[PDB]
């Protein structure tokens, strides 16, 4: 076997690189530091990390989020630290119970949470512009950003413009561990089985498309790393063994092959594609669609079953039924 | 009609099975004993799959469905139209897998590279066969498998989940849910990256495996490294299944309640209750 | 941790749908063997002489019996009401008409209700029907009642720890959560679903599009509405000892016909049979109990289909005595 | 009346529907499928065309030509025209047009077969500011190795016939990553050194063992023709020569193996 695939047998160490970027370069910091042990599987050097006034935003933002959060959960078991630690995955900050629309709710029904989510989507907001920044100061195209912009823009359709388009915040996530996932399941519910959702099945199948295409790139990759595979950029202005051999093993498995360069336009694009069709999803539903299994069945989709046990009428709509 | 650079690695040898007799290619397929077996496999497994939706209700796509037998028939072989087409197409299908499996590897030995793809693929085929297989064997009947159908497999999913109360709470499934966010992130990262750095716009330079690095330095305050987030992507995207295979068979073999009360382990300790 | 194989399974819907109940059987046997204390029918005796409306002279709901007949019916509920206090519990001994003791006019509403349950409900209770026992299980405070606040433990026999306690503020998530099988979802479903019938249960929309005028803004209900019926669904579930698919297809929880079981319909006849229990039966006993007996609100102790199928699809596995004991219902019109 | 409904029975998630399939379809055939034919496109035909008249398929296939600037001077365009000279020493098993084709020679010194490199420039790696970027100890003087793991100099090299082929003398890191690529040996019985890449090697505290060619096959490895750098093609060279003996090495390799 090519045991290097597995662990670095033999670890290298030399005087730490540093590239300059456009501007940040005294924004930097912290020493670096290695770990042998993270050295057999990973770059050992740890650190330093760049500061600058993007990511300090979005410390600052996300910290008031965090502390909003965590105060609202504190209450939730009057304010006891033993019970905090134990019931920590029960506890939540959570929109509003009762109906108001779009109104601003009082801080005791849903008000903490629309102000976590402002300072969360700040937070993110200020993230990005360092993502971007960073790409751009060290000369790079900006297509992680893209990525992540997308990832953003679903969590303010499930957050904030859904809610917005049927004109409900009851609608948005809950913050907490237990409390986003009851969410779930309870807006699965509402909107006729998620699962008769096409966005939501395109979705997945983009989703799953990345744990194959990671899988397949991955493993590819470590099989040709004994031609220098893992040096992408070299490999694609200049085409090596490598790269030939892994479009060969995909051309006569599959009788089609990519390139080292476009193999990740199609992870980039499944990964994008996760992000955008769960949107759509989200878009469509409340605002045009109210039940998606009754949606399939109207439009023919929909797999029916015989009865096993007895086929049940509805007893509220039996002679006599009371209410 | 072949690549420009294919020629001079279209070479005999490298069969596992079969030797001569099928090391040839058809168009752009390599073909060898493990592509005769999974072409068989495809031909009846397929033309099983349409028999059996001929005797149904329905040629729409997304509402056929071949399912398997009652749970009363057990482990046994079930009639044709109570089970036994699913039997026989679940068959046909591993035996489809595992050719494909089986054929990669030889593809690989021709080529000289590493048999990492095929051993990723197994993951996969294991996952199928704890679904359809291990889960069912131990529950005692096939009828605890999931059915062939676009649609109606996601009914099988919906009421398995359901079975639970609350399969969200399944630690196992939690894991392989973490599994696929992370990796689904990680491939968008990763490709990103690696396209930011061959295209920086404008005419400007192509960037340095330099620039990699300092990048997500910069950003995160550490960088995997070239190969070594290949070795990760791997890693991430297998244990989607070989963390959820654990949530699977704990469900119903060796867990009968709700998921979320098995938190209970944690919750109900007398120190704190 | 976790529970050693082999389970149990049934199936309950077409094959291949995953559709059954999943069951540990130690735990059956368990409750089986809890179940089976349900003390025998006492003999029959002969009917003969006078109606006891004749004999006795306080007797307001079975003025029909024979004394023969009566007593063996007082000996019953002794049997599964109080069986450690005794006749006493509800009598003086040297006055066995006197009202004076609280539990002998709650016996007798509780009496009148039983006959209601097995008369007018049988939609729900069929001909296996309800006894004294079947909620009291042998003492006076049912082990299995609700207030309109969550408490615990769920079996009111069990010690409380601190934080247990209903005024210990901190440990309210978790009273909420053991009733709604361990769940985060923060409702409770007993008295917003079945202390009365003021809220739907029902939240699904039967369009696959939107109508103008009750799909935007303040003309919707809040996704709160789901979240809590999804929250009695786990507490019934809980209750009767099983998982969705015993009464419904997942594809459609919204949808009757082939997508919902018998046992779905049966469940229906149930809110409503407990929504009137609650509402003409027991929530007005709060004038008649002694304080001790209420919770913080004033009120009295309720029922949910706990409190008689406790952890069971059938209470006590379908035992009945139905026949042993017809004074119990249904009763005959005019 | 409903949202989302339009005239003629249609409703708004329906259309979409159809208008994500397009988008799907367009950006995977029309995009990506092109991107994969930035590299050995048009085909090659086994008899004759080719420049007597293209298919017009053979220009729908590719994507316009992209220009790489190089970080380091020059640039480099794809797709473009890059047909293969070299005689290859194989020739035809049987004579259908998918039938394999077999080595007339030594494979592994006719580089045929997994013993095939590409043509790569014939230019020393750079690192960012522009220093060859794969260069042994001897010369990156300010790199070593991490403490608690093996130093191979003075080891012997063990082939795939239990022989000692001869002994370590240096690594070759690469001065970018900070990891090492290849490992340099002394040649028993031959006056030369040879490259070895890592991913060939088993490095155990007294021996490094290769089991990718024998012991008598390390006096054909390629050659680098400067002692102390390597060009990209050298580096194709030397790794494929090793791949090559996982078929070649010997006789049984080739055939089935259960
Ligand atoms: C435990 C949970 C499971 C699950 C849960 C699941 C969900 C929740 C959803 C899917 C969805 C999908 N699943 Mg399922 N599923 C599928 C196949 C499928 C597709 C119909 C679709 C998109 C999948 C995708 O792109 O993957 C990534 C792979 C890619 C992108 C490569 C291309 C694959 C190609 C689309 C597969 C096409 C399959 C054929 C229609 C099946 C017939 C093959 C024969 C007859 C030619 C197979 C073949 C299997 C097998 C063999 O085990 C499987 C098992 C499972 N699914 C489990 C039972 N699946 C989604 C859907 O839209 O369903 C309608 C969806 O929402
Ligand atoms: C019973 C209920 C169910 C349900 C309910 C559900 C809902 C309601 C929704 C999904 C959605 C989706 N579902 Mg589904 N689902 C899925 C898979 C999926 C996903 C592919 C997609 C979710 C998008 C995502 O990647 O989120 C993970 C990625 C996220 C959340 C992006 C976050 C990015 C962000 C920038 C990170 C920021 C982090 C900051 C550091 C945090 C700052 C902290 C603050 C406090 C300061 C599978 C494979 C199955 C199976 C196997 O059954 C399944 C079944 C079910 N789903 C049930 C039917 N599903 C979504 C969808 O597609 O709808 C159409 C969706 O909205
Ligand atoms: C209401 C019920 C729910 C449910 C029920 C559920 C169950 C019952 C199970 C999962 C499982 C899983 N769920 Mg969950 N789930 C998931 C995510 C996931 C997956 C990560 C995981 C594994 C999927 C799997 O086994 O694929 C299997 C895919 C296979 C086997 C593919 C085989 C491919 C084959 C080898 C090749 C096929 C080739 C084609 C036939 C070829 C076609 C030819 C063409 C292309 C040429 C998310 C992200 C969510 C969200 C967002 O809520 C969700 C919600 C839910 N799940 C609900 C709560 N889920 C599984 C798990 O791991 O649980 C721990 C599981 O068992
Ligand atoms: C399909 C594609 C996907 C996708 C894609 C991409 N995802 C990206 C990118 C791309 C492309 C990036 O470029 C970006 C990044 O940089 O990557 C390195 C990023 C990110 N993906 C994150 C998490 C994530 N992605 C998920 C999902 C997917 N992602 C899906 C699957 C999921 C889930 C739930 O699945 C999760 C959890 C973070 C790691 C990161 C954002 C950090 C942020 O926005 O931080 C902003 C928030 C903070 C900085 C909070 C700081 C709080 C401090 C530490 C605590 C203070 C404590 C105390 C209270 C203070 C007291 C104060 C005192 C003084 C009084
Ligand atoms: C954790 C890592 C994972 C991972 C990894 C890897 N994945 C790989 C590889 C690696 C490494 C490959 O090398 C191999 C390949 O070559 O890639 C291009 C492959 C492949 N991943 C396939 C599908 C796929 N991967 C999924 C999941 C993961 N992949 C996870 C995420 C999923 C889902 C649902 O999630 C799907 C659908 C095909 C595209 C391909 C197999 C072709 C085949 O086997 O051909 C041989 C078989 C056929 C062509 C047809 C067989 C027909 C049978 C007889 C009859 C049908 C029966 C069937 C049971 C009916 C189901 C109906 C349905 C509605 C219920
Ligand atoms: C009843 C009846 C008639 C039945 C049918 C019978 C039948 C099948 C007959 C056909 C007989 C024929 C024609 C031939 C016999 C020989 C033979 C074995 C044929 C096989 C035919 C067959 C079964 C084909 C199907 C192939 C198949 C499973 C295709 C699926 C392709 C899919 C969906 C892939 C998903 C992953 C995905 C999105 C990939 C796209 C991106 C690519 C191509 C990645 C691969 C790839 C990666 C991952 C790199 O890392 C990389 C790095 C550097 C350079 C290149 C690459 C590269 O190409
Ligand atoms: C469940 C639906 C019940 C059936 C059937 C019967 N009873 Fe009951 N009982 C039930 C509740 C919810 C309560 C209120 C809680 C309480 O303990 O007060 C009661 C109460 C009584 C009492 C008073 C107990 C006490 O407070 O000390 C008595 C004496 C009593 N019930 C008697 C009784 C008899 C005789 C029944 C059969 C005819 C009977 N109950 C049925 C719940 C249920
Ligand atoms: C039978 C004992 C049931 C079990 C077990 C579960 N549910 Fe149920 N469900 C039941 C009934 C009788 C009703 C209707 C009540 C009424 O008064 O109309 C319901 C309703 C639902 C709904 C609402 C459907 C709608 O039309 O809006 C949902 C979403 C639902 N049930 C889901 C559900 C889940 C998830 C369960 C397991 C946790 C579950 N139910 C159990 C009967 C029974
Ligand atoms: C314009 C107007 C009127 C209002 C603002 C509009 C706006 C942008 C609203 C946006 C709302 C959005 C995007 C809401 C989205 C919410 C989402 C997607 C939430 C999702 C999941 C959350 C999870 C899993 C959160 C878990 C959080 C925790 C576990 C936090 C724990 C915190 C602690 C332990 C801190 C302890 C600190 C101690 C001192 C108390
Ligand atoms: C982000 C898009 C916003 C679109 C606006 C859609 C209006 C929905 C109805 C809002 C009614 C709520 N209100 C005002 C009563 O509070
Ligand atoms: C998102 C802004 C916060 C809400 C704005 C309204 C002010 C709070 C008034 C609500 C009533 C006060 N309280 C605590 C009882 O909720
Ligand atoms: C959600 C966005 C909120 C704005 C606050 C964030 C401020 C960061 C701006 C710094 C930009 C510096 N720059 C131009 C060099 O990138
Ligand atoms: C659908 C696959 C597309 C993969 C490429 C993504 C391109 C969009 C990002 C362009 C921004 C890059 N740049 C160089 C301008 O900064
Ligand atoms: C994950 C859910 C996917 C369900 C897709 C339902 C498709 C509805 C659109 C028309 C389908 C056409 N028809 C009649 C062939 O069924
Ligand atoms: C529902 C998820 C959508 C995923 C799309 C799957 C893309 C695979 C396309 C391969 C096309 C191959 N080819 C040679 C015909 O172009
Ligand atoms: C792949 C493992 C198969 C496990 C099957 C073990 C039990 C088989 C019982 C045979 C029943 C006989 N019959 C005729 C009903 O099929
Ligand atoms: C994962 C390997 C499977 C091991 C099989 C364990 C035996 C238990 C099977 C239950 C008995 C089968 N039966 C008779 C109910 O059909």
């Known amino acids: 076997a090519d045991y290097q695939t597995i662990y670095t047998q033999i670890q290298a160490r030399g005087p730490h690189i540093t590239v300059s970027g456009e501007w940040g370069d005294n924004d930097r910091i912290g020493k670096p530091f290695y770990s042998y042990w993270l050295g057999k599987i990973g770059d050992a050097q740890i650190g330093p990390i760049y500061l600058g006034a993007s990511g300090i935003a979005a410390f600052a933002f996300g910290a008031t989020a965090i502390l909003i959060i965590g105060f609202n959960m504190l209450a939730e078991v009057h304010f006891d630290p033993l019970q905090f630690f134990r019931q920590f995955f029960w506890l939540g900050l959570y929109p509003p119970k009762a109906q108001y629309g779009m109104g601003i709710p009082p801080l005791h029904d849903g008000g903490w949470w629309l102000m976590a989510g402002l300072f969360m989507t700040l937070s993110l907001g200020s993230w990005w512009i360092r993502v971007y920044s960073r790409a751009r100061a060290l000369g790079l195209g900006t297509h992680i950003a893209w990525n992540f912009a997308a990832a953003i823009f679903f969590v303010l359709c499930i957050g904030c413009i859904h809610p917005a388009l049927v004109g409900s915040w009851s609608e948005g996530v809950p913050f907490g561990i237990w409390p986003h996932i009851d969410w779930l399941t309870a807006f699965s519910i509402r909107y006729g089985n998620f699962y008769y959702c096409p966005w939501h099945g395109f979705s997945i199948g983009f989703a799953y498309g990345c744990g194959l295409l990671f899988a397949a790139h991955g493993a590819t990759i470590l099989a040709v790393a004994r031609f220098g595979g893992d040096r992408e950029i070299e490999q694609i202005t200049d085409r090596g063994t490598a790269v030939e051999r892994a479009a060969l093993f995909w051309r006569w498995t599959i009788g089609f092959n990519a390139t080292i360069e476009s193999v990740h336009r199609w992870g980039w694009f499944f990964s994008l594609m996760v992000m955008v069709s769960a949107s759509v999803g989200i878009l469509l539903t409340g605002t045009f669609v109210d039940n998606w299994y009754l949606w399939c069945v109207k439009h023919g989709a929909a797999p029916d079953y015989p009865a096993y046990l007895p086929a049940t009428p509805d007893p509220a709509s039996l002679p006599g039924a009371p209410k | 009609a072949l690549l420009s650079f294919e020629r001079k690695y279209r070479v005999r040898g490298g069969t596992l099975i079969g030797g001569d007799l099928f090391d040839f290619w058809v168009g752009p397929y390599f073909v060898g004993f493990f592509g005769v077996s999974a072409i068989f496999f495809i031909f009846l497994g397929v033309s099983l799959i349409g028999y059996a939706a001929s005797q149904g209700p329905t040629w729409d796509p997304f509402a056929i469905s071949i399912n398997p037998p009652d749970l009363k028939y057990g482990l046994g072989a079930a009639p044709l139209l109570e089970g036994g087409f699913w039997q026989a197409i679940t068959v046909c299908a591993l035996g489809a897998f595992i050719s494909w499996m089986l054929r990669e590897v030889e593809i690989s030995r021709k080529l000289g590279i590493g048999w990492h793809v095929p051993l990723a693929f197994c993951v996969p085929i294991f996952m199928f066969c704890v679904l359809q297989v291990f889960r069912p064997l131990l529950l005692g009947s096939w009828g605890h498998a999931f059915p062939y159908g676009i649609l109606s497999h996601l009914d099988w999913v919906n009421n398995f989940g359901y079975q639970y109360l609350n399969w969200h709470y399944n630690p196992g499934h939690m894991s392989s849910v973490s599994f696929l966010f992370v990796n689904a992130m990680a491939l968008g990262l990763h490709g990103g990256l690696i396209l930011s750095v061959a295209n920086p716009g404008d005419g400007d330079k192509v960037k340095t495996a330099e620039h990699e690095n300092q990048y997500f330095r910069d950003v995160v305050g550490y960088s995997i490294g070239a190969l070594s987030i290949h070795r990760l992507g791997l890693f991430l995207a297998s244990n989607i299944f070989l963390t959820g295979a654990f949530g699977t068979i704990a469900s119903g073999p060796f867990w009968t309640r709700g998921w979320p009360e098995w938190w209970g382990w944690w919750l109900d300790i007398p120190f704190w209750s | 941790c976790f529970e050693p194989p082999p389970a149990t399974t049934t199936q309950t819907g077409f094959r291949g749908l995953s559709m059954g109940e999943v069951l540990h059987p130690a735990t059956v046997k368990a409750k089986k063997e809890r179940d089976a204390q349900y003390p025998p029918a006492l003999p029959a005796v002969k009917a003969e002489g006078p109606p006891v409306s004749q004999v006795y002279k306080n007797v307001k709901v079975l003025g029909n019996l024979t004394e023969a007949e009566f007593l063996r019916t007082m000996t019953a509920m002794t049997e599964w009401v109080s069986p450690e206090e005794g006749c006493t519990y509800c009598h003086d001994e040297n006055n066995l008409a006197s009202e004076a003791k609280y539990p002998y006019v709650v016996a007798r509403r509780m009496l009148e209700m039983t006959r209601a349950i097995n008369t007018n409900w049988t939609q729900h209770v069929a001909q296996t029907g309800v006894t004294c026992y079947t909620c009291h299980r042998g003492t006076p405070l049912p082990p299995y009642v609700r207030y309109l606040e969550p408490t615990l433990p769920l079996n009111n026999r069990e010690t409380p720890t601190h934080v247990e306690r209903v005024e210990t503020r901190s440990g309210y998530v978790v009273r909420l959560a053991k009733y709604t099988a361990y769940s985060a979802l923060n409702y409770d479903p007993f008295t917003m679903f079945l202390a009365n019938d003021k809220r739907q249960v029902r939240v699904v929309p039967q369009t696959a599009l939107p109508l103008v005028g009750v799909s935007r803004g303040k003309e919707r209900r809040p996704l709160s509405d789901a979240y809590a019926t999804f929250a009695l669904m786990m507490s019934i579930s809980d209750s009767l000892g099983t998982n969705c698919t015993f009464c419904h297809n997942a594809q459609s929880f919204e949808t009757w016909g082939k997508k919902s079981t018998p046992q779905r319909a049966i469940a229906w006849w149930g809110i409503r049979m407990v929504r009137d229990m609650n509402m003409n039966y027991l929530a007005p006993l709060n004038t008649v109990l002694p304080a001790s007996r209420l919770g913080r609100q004033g009120e009295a102790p309720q029922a949910d289909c706990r409190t008689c199928h406790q952890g069971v699809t059938k209470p006590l596995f379908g035992a009945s005595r139905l026949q042993d004991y017809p004074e119990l219902g249904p009763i005959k019109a005019a | ?258």
């Open chain 4, 1 to 258: 009346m409903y949202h989302g409904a339009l005239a003629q029975h249609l409703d708004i998630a329906q259309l979409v529907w159809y208008a994500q399939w397009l988008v799907i379809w367009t950006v995977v055939l029309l995009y990506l499928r092109r991107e994969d034919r930035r590299e050995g496109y048009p085909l090659v035909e086994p008899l004759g065309l080719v420049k007597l008249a293209p298919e017009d398929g053979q220009v729908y296939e590719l994507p316009y030509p992209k220009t790489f600037v190089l970080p380091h001077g020059g640039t480099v365009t794809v797709p473009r025209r890059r047909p293969e000279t070299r005689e290859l020493k194989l020739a035809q098993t049987d004579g259908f047009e998918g039938a394999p084709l077999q080595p007339t020679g030594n494979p592994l010194v006719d580089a045929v077969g997994p013993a095939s490199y590409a043509e790569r420039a014939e230019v020393v790696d750079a690192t960012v500011d522009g220093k060859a970027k794969i260069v042994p100890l001897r010369v990156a003087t300010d790199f070593s190795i991490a403490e608690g793991d093996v130093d191979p100099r003075g080891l012997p090299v063990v082939a795939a016939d239990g022989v000692e082929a001869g002994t370590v003398t240096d690594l070759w890191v690469d001065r970018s990553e900070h990891y090492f690529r290849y490992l340099e040996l002394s040649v028993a019985g031959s006056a030369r050194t040879a490259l070895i890449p890592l991913g060939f090697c088993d490095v155990k505290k007294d021996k490094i063992v290769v089991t990718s060619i024998l012991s008598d096959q390390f006096a054909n490895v390629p050659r680098l023709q400067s002692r102390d750098q390597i060009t990209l093609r050298e580096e194709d060279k030397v790794s494929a020569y090793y791949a090559g003996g996982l078929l070649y090495a010997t006789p049984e390799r080739a055939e089935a193996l259960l």
